[PDB]
Each structure stands twice: as structure tokens, then as C-alpha cells.
Amino acid sequence: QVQLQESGPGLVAPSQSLSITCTVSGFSLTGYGVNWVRQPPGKGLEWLGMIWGDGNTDYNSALKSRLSISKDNSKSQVFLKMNSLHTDDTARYYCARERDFRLDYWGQGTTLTVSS
Amino acid sequence: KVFGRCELAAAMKRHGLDNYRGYSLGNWVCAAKFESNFNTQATNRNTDGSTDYGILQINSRWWCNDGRTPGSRNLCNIPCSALLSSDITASVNCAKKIVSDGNGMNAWVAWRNRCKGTDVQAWIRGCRL
Amino acid sequence: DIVLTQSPASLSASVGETVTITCRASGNIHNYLAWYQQKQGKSPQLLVYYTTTLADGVPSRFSGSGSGTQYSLKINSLQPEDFGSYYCQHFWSTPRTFGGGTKLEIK
């Protein structure tokens, strides 16, 4: 069955860069896009970017220059890298599978806190 | 007849392919690009006596009858010659029979290999429909 | 970018009531709109895609509508398990954006 799970550092300082991993199973990364979405504490959903089955990427306009998304089809993993961390970046981060223009399966999410 | 991408998109939407079995219109336009490069008269003989006909390259062993393919099933109950027309009705009607569920577009190897997983919407943005 | 204006921010209702959540896009999204439901402490779950299509397993009490720039999610005869937050998201080109959310709570 389809499954996505995020793994991340938990707490990070501005002087650190951030990488979160999304391991998926039950489908091939070549046939589906994977979107990254975040939810700050008690706030609404924010779209970060995506990576198509073909490897092309698209990002949130305001965050493009701090974000980088890549994947390893063989390890069945997708990565989100962020730099220039702000405290506003504290949030729950999710990866979701995109099937023909709808996010049909989501991971449980991983919580990130941006310290001093 | 070689269609333009928007002209084809419009005719497909007009024939019920937009969101048919959950497939966005882009998928169908992308499949036609890679199967017949928008040509209504495209044909293609396979090693096996089977020949794929028209805009969606429908097979003569299983879907239409060209009367020269050994053991034709003709599941769309149509002669392969009609699939070669400027008017895509017959081709669309048979493709509808073929796609019985939300995975049936796998019936086109080109779509599975060249369209699935990519931005198929790109084929229709800017089109009037 | 195409921005979505979702309203109301919050809604109080009783089981059995019928409610309507709306999403208005700053530009024509051509029906590429989905709705998710998020329950307390869980991940968003898909309900409706391409404006009117129900995801598998979603009860028919949920129904979507809209064209061009105004879109609605109607919930007929609310059940106890329908309470939580609701989000619309568009899929017309990129970047994609989400509506601000609607908290649906017990009257």
C-alpha cells in the first residue's frame, strides 16, 4: 500500500542548513510527483514546492531562493533542503504524493523548531 | 488530418474525455502527441499481424477489426478503417471502452512512459475550452 | 501567483445541519481545485478533486461546485466525524497555493 514518512532534525539553529527526507513505498517516484507542504503551529497549510516524476522542480515564489528539492528514485527518497533559516520556519513539514493534480496520500509529518 | 494541440483538446473535451475515469484532459492530449503525433491517419504494423490505427493508435487484434489480423477480438465492435478519420468520435468512443477504470490509460505505453508523472496540463494551458 | 480567499474562517454547526465553505481564486483556475479535511492531530486527507469529484471512500454527503473563480464545498447532514478543518488548494500551473482554512466546529 502507499506510504510516505518524513524524517528531520527536530531543532535547528540559523547557522545550520536543513534537510528533511521523505521515504515512500508502494509506488515509483518516476510515475508521480511529490509535494512538500508546511503547517506552522496553529496556522494553515503552506505550499513549499514539488518535484515531478521526471525530475523537474517548482517552488513557492517567495521561498525559491532558500529551497532545494531533489530525489533518489532508487532509494525511493525525496529531499527538501532549506538554508537561511528564520524562526518563522518553525512548523510541521509534510511530503505528499501528487497523482494527476491532487495530493492523494500524505506522510504523517515531522516537526521542526528553529532555535536561536 | 494533423490537429493542433488546442483544436484536439477542444474536440476531446467536447467528447467527454475531460476527467473521464479521473484522468485530466492533459493526459489524452499528451497520449495522442506521443502515439500518433496528432495524426488521424497514423498506422503502425507490429511484428505480430496487429496494426495500431488512428489518432490513439488502437490495436487491430483486440479492439477494431482490420480483417487481416489473426484472431481479432474486436472488443470495440468497429472496423479499423473508421478509426482513421478527421472526426475523432469513433476513436474516442473506443478509447472510452478501453479505459474501464482509473488505471486504464496504461493501455497506451507512450502515456505510461512519456506522460505519466509529468505536467500534462502544460499541453492545454493557453487553449480556449 | 493565484491566491485563494476562503471563508468563513470558522463555522459552528450541529449534526444534521448543511454547511457551505467557499474559495474564491484571484484568477481563473479552470476547475483545478481540490478540498482536504484535516482532523485534530492528523494529516490532511483528500475529499474532492477537479472541483466535483469525490475521492475514493468519501461519503456522498460531501459535494463540490464552482467554475472559473468561485468554488464551494457543501456538506449535507453533518455527522460527528465531519468536524475539523477544511482547505481548498488550486493546481493551475505553479506555484500552487492553499485557501486560508475553515475550522468547522460543534454548536
mmCIF file of C-alpha atoms in Angstrom:
data_model
loop_
_atom_site.group_PDB
_atom_site.id
_atom_site.type_symbol
_atom_site.label_atom_id
_atom_site.label_comp_id
_atom_site.label_asym_id
_atom_site.label_seq_id
_atom_site.Cartn_x
_atom_site.Cartn_y
_atom_site.Cartn_z
ATOM 1 C CA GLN A 1 0.000 0.000 0.000
ATOM 2 C CA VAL A 2 1.120 3.585 -0.492
ATOM 3 C CA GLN A 3 3.123 5.120 2.414
ATOM 4 C CA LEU A 4 5.192 8.299 2.949
ATOM 5 C CA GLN A 5 7.238 9.134 6.047
ATOM 6 C CA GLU A 6 9.255 12.216 6.867
ATOM 7 C CA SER A 7 12.423 12.321 8.977
ATOM 8 C CA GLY A 8 14.095 15.544 10.051
ATOM 9 C CA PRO A 9 16.422 17.038 12.714
ATOM 10 C CA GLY A 10 13.786 18.350 15.112
ATOM 11 C CA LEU A 11 15.594 21.501 16.316
ATOM 12 C CA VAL A 12 17.961 23.679 14.216
ATOM 13 C CA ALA A 13 19.875 26.972 14.591
ATOM 14 C CA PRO A 14 20.074 29.674 11.849
ATOM 15 C CA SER A 15 23.700 28.724 11.275
ATOM 16 C CA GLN A 16 22.616 25.258 10.204
ATOM 17 C CA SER A 17 21.070 24.186 6.940
ATOM 18 C CA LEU A 18 18.047 21.940 6.928
ATOM 19 C CA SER A 19 17.387 18.651 5.193
ATOM 20 C CA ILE A 20 14.205 16.621 5.632
ATOM 21 C CA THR A 21 13.744 13.221 3.975
ATOM 22 C CA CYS A 22 10.592 11.662 2.588
ATOM 23 C CA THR A 23 10.827 7.845 2.154
ATOM 24 C CA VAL A 24 7.994 6.413 0.183
ATOM 25 C CA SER A 25 6.808 2.937 -0.655
ATOM 26 C CA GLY A 26 4.072 1.301 -2.682
ATOM 27 C CA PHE A 27 4.722 3.412 -5.820
ATOM 28 C CA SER A 28 7.551 4.541 -8.090
ATOM 29 C CA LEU A 29 8.950 8.094 -7.904
ATOM 30 C CA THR A 30 9.151 8.142 -11.701
ATOM 31 C CA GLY A 31 5.380 7.930 -12.106
ATOM 32 C CA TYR A 32 4.279 10.584 -9.536
ATOM 33 C CA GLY A 33 5.192 14.000 -8.244
ATOM 34 C CA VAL A 34 5.928 14.611 -4.586
ATOM 35 C CA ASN A 35 4.934 17.976 -2.978
ATOM 36 C CA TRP A 36 6.322 19.496 0.197
ATOM 37 C CA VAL A 37 3.861 21.427 2.414
ATOM 38 C CA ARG A 38 4.235 23.032 5.830
ATOM 39 C CA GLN A 39 1.937 23.992 8.711
ATOM 40 C CA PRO A 40 3.169 26.419 11.324
ATOM 41 C CA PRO A 41 1.736 25.831 14.866
ATOM 42 C CA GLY A 42 -1.933 26.619 14.841
ATOM 43 C CA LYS A 43 -1.765 28.048 11.279
ATOM 44 C CA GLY A 44 -2.937 26.992 7.794
ATOM 45 C CA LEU A 45 -1.191 24.906 5.091
ATOM 46 C CA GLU A 46 1.644 26.478 3.086
ATOM 47 C CA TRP A 47 2.919 25.050 -0.237
ATOM 48 C CA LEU A 48 6.768 24.816 -0.456
ATOM 49 C CA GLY A 49 7.362 23.207 -3.846
ATOM 50 C CA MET A 50 7.319 19.944 -5.728
ATOM 51 C CA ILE A 51 9.352 17.524 -7.862
ATOM 52 C CA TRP A 52 7.636 15.931 -10.840
ATOM 53 C CA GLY A 53 8.073 12.260 -11.825
ATOM 54 C CA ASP A 54 10.511 13.478 -14.486
ATOM 55 C CA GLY A 55 12.702 15.362 -12.071
ATOM 56 C CA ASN A 56 11.661 18.882 -12.866
ATOM 57 C CA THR A 57 11.079 21.075 -9.759
ATOM 58 C CA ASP A 58 8.820 24.098 -8.965
ATOM 59 C CA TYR A 59 8.907 26.274 -5.891
ATOM 60 C CA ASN A 60 6.972 28.693 -3.774
ATOM 61 C CA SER A 61 7.838 32.127 -5.287
ATOM 62 C CA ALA A 62 8.679 33.802 -2.009
ATOM 63 C CA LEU A 63 10.915 30.939 -0.864
ATOM 64 C CA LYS A 64 12.520 29.669 -4.137
ATOM 65 C CA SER A 65 15.981 31.068 -3.331
ATOM 66 C CA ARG A 66 16.240 29.228 0.063
ATOM 67 C CA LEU A 67 14.822 25.965 -1.139
ATOM 68 C CA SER A 68 16.135 22.986 -2.994
ATOM 69 C CA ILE A 69 14.248 19.727 -3.670
ATOM 70 C CA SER A 70 15.835 16.530 -5.116
ATOM 71 C CA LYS A 71 15.115 12.810 -5.153
ATOM 72 C CA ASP A 72 16.818 9.412 -5.477
ATOM 73 C CA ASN A 73 14.483 7.113 -7.458
ATOM 74 C CA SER A 74 16.484 4.049 -6.371
ATOM 75 C CA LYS A 75 16.376 4.786 -2.678
ATOM 76 C CA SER A 76 12.717 5.820 -3.035
ATOM 77 C CA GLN A 77 13.573 9.023 -1.197
ATOM 78 C CA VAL A 78 12.829 12.753 -1.815
ATOM 79 C CA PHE A 79 14.738 15.507 -0.003
ATOM 80 C CA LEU A 80 13.922 19.066 0.964
ATOM 81 C CA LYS A 81 16.877 21.307 1.777
ATOM 82 C CA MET A 82 16.450 24.786 3.323
ATOM 83 C CA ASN A 83 19.035 27.398 4.183
ATOM 84 C CA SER A 84 18.954 30.875 5.749
ATOM 85 C CA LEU A 85 16.606 29.554 8.455
ATOM 86 C CA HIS A 86 14.262 32.031 10.151
ATOM 87 C CA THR A 87 12.191 31.387 13.299
ATOM 88 C CA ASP A 88 9.131 31.719 11.039
ATOM 89 C CA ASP A 89 10.304 28.403 9.605
ATOM 90 C CA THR A 90 9.200 26.504 12.745
ATOM 91 C CA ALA A 91 6.408 24.245 11.533
ATOM 92 C CA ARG A 92 5.241 20.730 10.775
ATOM 93 C CA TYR A 93 6.634 19.613 7.409
ATOM 94 C CA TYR A 94 4.840 17.163 5.140
ATOM 95 C CA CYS A 95 5.538 15.366 1.902
ATOM 96 C CA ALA A 96 2.588 14.317 -0.194
ATOM 97 C CA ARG A 97 2.130 12.281 -3.347
ATOM 98 C CA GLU A 98 0.616 14.029 -6.334
ATOM 99 C CA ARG A 99 -1.439 11.950 -8.677
ATOM 100 C CA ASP A 100 -2.868 13.847 -11.720
ATOM 101 C CA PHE A 101 -3.377 17.172 -9.900
ATOM 102 C CA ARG A 102 -4.478 16.167 -6.355
ATOM 103 C CA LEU A 103 -2.457 15.199 -3.294
ATOM 104 C CA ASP A 104 -3.855 11.735 -2.664
ATOM 105 C CA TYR A 105 -1.565 10.360 0.103
ATOM 106 C CA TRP A 106 0.289 12.362 2.802
ATOM 107 C CA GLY A 107 3.004 11.439 5.246
ATOM 108 C CA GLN A 108 2.438 11.957 8.965
ATOM 109 C CA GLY A 109 4.706 14.982 9.019
ATOM 110 C CA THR A 110 7.738 15.878 11.070
ATOM 111 C CA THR A 111 8.001 18.850 13.439
ATOM 112 C CA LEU A 112 10.829 21.382 13.059
ATOM 113 C CA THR A 113 11.747 24.163 15.509
ATOM 114 C CA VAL A 114 14.137 26.947 14.550
ATOM 115 C CA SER A 115 16.068 27.965 17.689
ATOM 116 C CA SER A 116 18.302 30.953 18.496
ATOM 117 C CA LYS B 1 -5.554 15.342 -40.601
ATOM 118 C CA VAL B 2 -2.942 16.627 -38.174
ATOM 119 C CA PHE B 3 -4.536 18.530 -35.314
ATOM 120 C CA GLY B 4 -3.187 21.468 -33.403
ATOM 121 C CA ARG B 5 -2.908 20.791 -29.636
ATOM 122 C CA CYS B 6 -5.734 23.180 -28.677
ATOM 123 C CA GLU B 7 -8.017 22.081 -31.505
ATOM 124 C CA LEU B 8 -7.590 18.468 -30.422
ATOM 125 C CA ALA B 9 -8.045 19.400 -26.711
ATOM 126 C CA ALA B 10 -11.293 21.143 -27.531
ATOM 127 C CA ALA B 11 -12.625 18.207 -29.524
ATOM 128 C CA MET B 12 -11.681 15.804 -26.731
ATOM 129 C CA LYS B 13 -13.383 17.860 -24.008
ATOM 130 C CA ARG B 14 -16.326 18.084 -26.339
ATOM 131 C CA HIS B 15 -16.463 14.285 -26.456
ATOM 132 C CA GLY B 16 -16.358 13.636 -22.718
ATOM 133 C CA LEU B 17 -12.661 12.950 -22.089
ATOM 134 C CA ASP B 18 -12.073 15.734 -19.542
ATOM 135 C CA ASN B 19 -11.799 13.895 -16.169
ATOM 136 C CA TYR B 20 -13.093 10.619 -17.680
ATOM 137 C CA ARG B 21 -12.407 7.978 -15.034
ATOM 138 C CA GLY B 22 -10.482 10.655 -13.170
ATOM 139 C CA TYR B 23 -7.963 11.458 -15.955
ATOM 140 C CA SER B 24 -7.404 15.207 -16.557
ATOM 141 C CA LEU B 25 -7.756 16.365 -20.200
ATOM 142 C CA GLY B 26 -3.941 16.867 -20.420
ATOM 143 C CA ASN B 27 -3.331 13.071 -20.315
ATOM 144 C CA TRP B 28 -5.332 12.442 -23.513
ATOM 145 C CA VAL B 29 -3.662 15.245 -25.477
ATOM 146 C CA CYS B 30 -0.215 14.033 -24.271
ATOM 147 C CA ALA B 31 -1.027 10.420 -25.298
ATOM 148 C CA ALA B 32 -2.023 11.493 -28.819
ATOM 149 C CA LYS B 33 1.158 13.557 -29.170
ATOM 150 C CA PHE B 34 3.391 10.544 -28.400
ATOM 151 C CA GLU B 35 1.240 7.886 -30.151
ATOM 152 C CA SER B 36 0.358 9.482 -33.444
ATOM 153 C CA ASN B 37 1.923 12.944 -33.205
ATOM 154 C CA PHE B 38 -1.654 14.265 -33.668
ATOM 155 C CA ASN B 39 -2.134 12.444 -36.962
ATOM 156 C CA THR B 40 -5.595 10.912 -37.573
ATOM 157 C CA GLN B 41 -4.199 8.534 -40.202
ATOM 158 C CA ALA B 42 -1.204 7.206 -38.284
ATOM 159 C CA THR B 43 -0.853 3.420 -38.542
ATOM 160 C CA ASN B 44 1.803 1.103 -37.297
ATOM 161 C CA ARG B 45 2.331 -2.531 -38.017
ATOM 162 C CA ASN B 46 3.729 -4.579 -35.130
ATOM 163 C CA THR B 47 5.748 -7.804 -35.705
ATOM 164 C CA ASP B 48 2.531 -9.644 -34.868
ATOM 165 C CA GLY B 49 -0.012 -9.093 -37.624
ATOM 166 C CA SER B 50 -1.640 -6.471 -35.370
ATOM 167 C CA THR B 51 -1.714 -2.896 -36.573
ATOM 168 C CA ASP B 52 -2.429 0.207 -34.402
ATOM 169 C CA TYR B 53 -4.775 2.690 -36.041
ATOM 170 C CA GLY B 54 -5.541 6.437 -35.884
ATOM 171 C CA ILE B 55 -5.080 9.331 -33.501
ATOM 172 C CA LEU B 56 -4.911 6.985 -30.464
ATOM 173 C CA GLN B 57 -3.277 4.002 -32.160
ATOM 174 C CA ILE B 58 -5.938 1.459 -31.395
ATOM 175 C CA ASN B 59 -4.946 -2.195 -31.891
ATOM 176 C CA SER B 60 -6.466 -4.488 -34.543
ATOM 177 C CA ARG B 61 -6.014 -7.743 -32.590
ATOM 178 C CA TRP B 62 -8.154 -6.614 -29.635
ATOM 179 C CA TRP B 63 -10.200 -3.513 -30.380
ATOM 180 C CA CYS B 64 -11.046 -2.959 -34.002
ATOM 181 C CA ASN B 65 -11.193 -5.281 -36.949
ATOM 182 C CA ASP B 66 -8.926 -4.692 -39.941
ATOM 183 C CA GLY B 67 -9.837 -8.159 -41.253
ATOM 184 C CA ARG B 68 -6.200 -9.098 -41.719
ATOM 185 C CA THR B 69 -5.175 -9.757 -38.135
ATOM 186 C CA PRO B 70 -5.125 -13.387 -36.931
ATOM 187 C CA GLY B 71 -7.523 -13.890 -34.027
ATOM 188 C CA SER B 72 -9.064 -10.417 -33.726
ATOM 189 C CA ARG B 73 -11.401 -9.929 -30.757
ATOM 190 C CA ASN B 74 -12.830 -6.607 -31.970
ATOM 191 C CA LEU B 75 -13.915 -5.550 -28.451
ATOM 192 C CA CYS B 76 -14.955 -2.099 -29.683
ATOM 193 C CA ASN B 77 -17.054 -3.675 -32.411
ATOM 194 C CA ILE B 78 -15.702 -1.332 -35.123
ATOM 195 C CA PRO B 79 -13.653 -1.720 -38.327
ATOM 196 C CA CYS B 80 -10.136 -0.291 -38.000
ATOM 197 C CA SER B 81 -10.720 1.856 -41.083
ATOM 198 C CA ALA B 82 -13.195 4.130 -39.247
ATOM 199 C CA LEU B 83 -10.554 4.918 -36.638
ATOM 200 C CA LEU B 84 -8.727 6.706 -39.453
ATOM 201 C CA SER B 85 -10.894 9.791 -39.687
ATOM 202 C CA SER B 86 -10.647 13.574 -39.180
ATOM 203 C CA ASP B 87 -13.646 13.273 -36.882
ATOM 204 C CA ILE B 88 -12.414 11.629 -33.640
ATOM 205 C CA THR B 89 -15.778 10.267 -32.432
ATOM 206 C CA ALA B 90 -15.178 6.599 -33.250
ATOM 207 C CA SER B 91 -11.693 6.785 -31.807
ATOM 208 C CA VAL B 92 -12.947 8.417 -28.636
ATOM 209 C CA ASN B 93 -15.803 6.001 -28.187
ATOM 210 C CA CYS B 94 -13.460 3.037 -28.426
ATOM 211 C CA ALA B 95 -10.909 4.644 -26.056
ATOM 212 C CA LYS B 96 -13.764 5.016 -23.542
ATOM 213 C CA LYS B 97 -14.431 1.265 -23.687
ATOM 214 C CA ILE B 98 -10.768 0.565 -23.238
ATOM 215 C CA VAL B 99 -10.407 2.800 -20.151
ATOM 216 C CA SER B 100 -12.686 0.917 -17.791
ATOM 217 C CA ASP B 101 -11.156 2.305 -14.621
ATOM 218 C CA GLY B 102 -8.696 4.820 -13.202
ATOM 219 C CA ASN B 103 -5.626 2.876 -14.384
ATOM 220 C CA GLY B 104 -6.823 2.072 -17.857
ATOM 221 C CA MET B 105 -4.649 4.698 -19.547
ATOM 222 C CA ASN B 106 -1.868 2.134 -19.074
ATOM 223 C CA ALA B 107 -3.370 0.754 -22.304
ATOM 224 C CA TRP B 108 -1.051 3.237 -24.028
ATOM 225 C CA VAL B 109 2.588 2.506 -23.352
ATOM 226 C CA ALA B 110 3.546 6.016 -24.602
ATOM 227 C CA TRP B 111 1.318 7.660 -21.974
ATOM 228 C CA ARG B 112 2.717 5.393 -19.248
ATOM 229 C CA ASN B 113 6.270 6.100 -20.292
ATOM 230 C CA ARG B 114 6.217 9.670 -21.595
ATOM 231 C CA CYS B 115 3.202 11.406 -19.937
ATOM 232 C CA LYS B 116 2.519 9.842 -16.574
ATOM 233 C CA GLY B 117 4.339 11.729 -13.867
ATOM 234 C CA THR B 118 4.880 14.908 -15.860
ATOM 235 C CA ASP B 119 2.998 18.159 -16.249
ATOM 236 C CA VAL B 120 0.402 17.018 -18.736
ATOM 237 C CA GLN B 121 -1.610 20.212 -18.034
ATOM 238 C CA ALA B 122 1.114 22.088 -19.978
ATOM 239 C CA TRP B 123 -0.444 20.694 -23.161
ATOM 240 C CA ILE B 124 -3.664 22.598 -22.604
ATOM 241 C CA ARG B 125 -2.756 25.844 -20.786
ATOM 242 C CA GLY B 126 -3.482 28.792 -23.093
ATOM 243 C CA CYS B 127 -6.049 26.740 -25.008
ATOM 244 C CA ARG B 128 -9.609 28.034 -25.358
ATOM 245 C CA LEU B 129 -12.006 25.478 -23.860
ATOM 246 C CA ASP C 1 0.505 33.958 -8.044
ATOM 247 C CA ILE C 2 -3.137 32.909 -7.926
ATOM 248 C CA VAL C 3 -4.277 33.499 -4.331
ATOM 249 C CA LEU C 4 -7.299 31.769 -2.764
ATOM 250 C CA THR C 5 -9.738 33.587 -0.372
ATOM 251 C CA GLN C 6 -11.527 31.008 1.730
ATOM 252 C CA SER C 7 -14.437 31.873 4.017
ATOM 253 C CA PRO C 8 -15.666 31.698 6.610
ATOM 254 C CA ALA C 9 -12.689 31.348 8.925
ATOM 255 C CA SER C 10 -14.855 29.426 11.370
ATOM 256 C CA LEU C 11 -18.267 27.821 11.391
ATOM 257 C CA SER C 12 -20.340 26.375 14.337
ATOM 258 C CA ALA C 13 -22.880 23.806 13.461
ATOM 259 C CA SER C 14 -24.947 20.918 14.702
ATOM 260 C CA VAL C 15 -25.063 17.341 13.483
ATOM 261 C CA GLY C 16 -27.650 17.160 10.772
ATOM 262 C CA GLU C 17 -27.060 20.701 9.526
ATOM 263 C CA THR C 18 -25.922 21.552 5.999
ATOM 264 C CA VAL C 19 -22.968 23.914 5.635
ATOM 265 C CA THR C 20 -21.107 25.616 2.764
ATOM 266 C CA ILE C 21 -17.428 26.564 2.579
ATOM 267 C CA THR C 22 -16.206 28.883 -0.187
ATOM 268 C CA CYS C 23 -12.966 29.512 -2.063
ATOM 269 C CA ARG C 24 -12.546 32.373 -4.492
ATOM 270 C CA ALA C 25 -9.436 32.464 -6.691
ATOM 271 C CA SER C 26 -7.673 35.684 -7.758
ATOM 272 C CA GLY C 27 -7.584 34.253 -11.287
ATOM 273 C CA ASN C 28 -9.316 31.580 -13.347
ATOM 274 C CA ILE C 29 -8.094 28.178 -12.201
ATOM 275 C CA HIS C 30 -10.159 26.269 -14.729
ATOM 276 C CA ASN C 31 -11.644 23.763 -12.285
ATOM 277 C CA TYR C 32 -8.281 22.572 -10.914
ATOM 278 C CA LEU C 33 -9.364 22.714 -7.368
ATOM 279 C CA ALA C 34 -9.232 20.189 -4.511
ATOM 280 C CA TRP C 35 -10.544 20.129 -0.912
ATOM 281 C CA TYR C 36 -8.917 18.425 2.070
ATOM 282 C CA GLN C 37 -10.160 17.708 5.549
ATOM 283 C CA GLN C 38 -7.773 17.816 8.443
ATOM 284 C CA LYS C 39 -8.713 16.344 11.818
ATOM 285 C CA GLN C 40 -7.023 17.357 15.035
ATOM 286 C CA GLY C 41 -3.535 15.883 15.151
ATOM 287 C CA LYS C 42 -3.744 14.119 11.764
ATOM 288 C CA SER C 43 -2.584 14.842 8.179
ATOM 289 C CA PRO C 44 -4.826 16.416 5.608
ATOM 290 C CA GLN C 45 -6.887 13.921 3.698
ATOM 291 C CA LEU C 46 -8.208 14.358 0.206
ATOM 292 C CA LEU C 47 -12.003 14.783 -0.231
ATOM 293 C CA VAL C 48 -12.704 16.302 -3.635
ATOM 294 C CA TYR C 49 -10.515 16.887 -6.708
ATOM 295 C CA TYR C 50 -11.153 18.686 -10.033
ATOM 296 C CA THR C 51 -13.949 20.650 -8.367
ATOM 297 C CA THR C 52 -16.690 17.988 -8.158
ATOM 298 C CA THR C 53 -15.018 14.567 -7.884
ATOM 299 C CA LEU C 54 -15.166 12.646 -4.690
ATOM 300 C CA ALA C 55 -12.106 10.804 -3.591
ATOM 301 C CA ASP C 56 -12.493 7.068 -3.060
ATOM 302 C CA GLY C 57 -14.250 6.211 0.142
ATOM 303 C CA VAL C 58 -15.587 9.730 0.724
ATOM 304 C CA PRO C 59 -19.353 9.734 1.506
ATOM 305 C CA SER C 60 -21.753 11.378 -0.870
ATOM 306 C CA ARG C 61 -22.857 13.886 1.710
ATOM 307 C CA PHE C 62 -19.854 15.998 0.531
ATOM 308 C CA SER C 63 -20.273 17.770 -2.785
ATOM 309 C CA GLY C 64 -18.221 20.310 -4.667
ATOM 310 C CA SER C 65 -19.105 23.078 -7.089
ATOM 311 C CA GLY C 66 -17.711 26.003 -8.984
ATOM 312 C CA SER C 67 -16.356 27.290 -12.286
ATOM 313 C CA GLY C 68 -13.875 29.964 -13.229
ATOM 314 C CA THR C 69 -13.136 31.727 -9.892
ATOM 315 C CA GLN C 70 -15.692 30.858 -7.218
ATOM 316 C CA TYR C 71 -15.725 27.366 -5.672
ATOM 317 C CA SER C 72 -17.811 25.717 -2.892
ATOM 318 C CA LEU C 73 -17.770 22.623 -0.766
ATOM 319 C CA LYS C 74 -21.253 21.739 0.544
ATOM 320 C CA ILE C 75 -21.588 19.226 3.427
ATOM 321 C CA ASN C 76 -25.133 17.807 3.641
ATOM 322 C CA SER C 77 -26.304 16.420 7.037
ATOM 323 C CA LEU C 78 -23.170 16.943 9.047
ATOM 324 C CA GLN C 79 -22.015 13.895 11.096
ATOM 325 C CA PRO C 80 -19.844 13.830 14.197
ATOM 326 C CA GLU C 81 -16.784 12.826 12.184
ATOM 327 C CA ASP C 82 -17.055 15.843 9.849
ATOM 328 C CA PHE C 83 -15.789 18.344 12.398
ATOM 329 C CA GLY C 84 -12.205 19.601 11.867
ATOM 330 C CA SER C 85 -10.505 21.998 9.403
ATOM 331 C CA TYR C 86 -11.059 22.283 5.680
ATOM 332 C CA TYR C 87 -8.709 23.610 2.985
ATOM 333 C CA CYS C 88 -9.035 24.284 -0.688
ATOM 334 C CA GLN C 89 -5.948 24.101 -2.946
ATOM 335 C CA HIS C 90 -5.574 25.012 -6.642
ATOM 336 C CA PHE C 91 -3.489 23.132 -9.262
ATOM 337 C CA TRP C 92 -3.422 25.595 -12.173
ATOM 338 C CA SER C 93 0.210 25.908 -13.170
ATOM 339 C CA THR C 94 2.660 26.828 -10.379
ATOM 340 C CA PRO C 95 3.106 27.932 -7.734
ATOM 341 C CA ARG C 96 0.216 26.149 -6.019
ATOM 342 C CA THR C 97 -1.411 27.869 -3.002
ATOM 343 C CA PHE C 98 -3.953 26.883 -0.318
ATOM 344 C CA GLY C 99 -7.003 28.773 0.937
ATOM 345 C CA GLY C 100 -6.714 30.016 4.494
ATOM 346 C CA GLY C 101 -8.760 27.255 6.055
ATOM 347 C CA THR C 102 -12.132 26.935 7.755
ATOM 348 C CA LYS C 103 -12.498 25.461 11.237
ATOM 349 C CA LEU C 104 -15.838 23.580 11.387
ATOM 350 C CA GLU C 105 -16.929 23.155 14.940
ATOM 351 C CA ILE C 106 -19.686 21.746 17.109
ATOM 352 C CA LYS C 107 -22.545 24.054 18.029
#
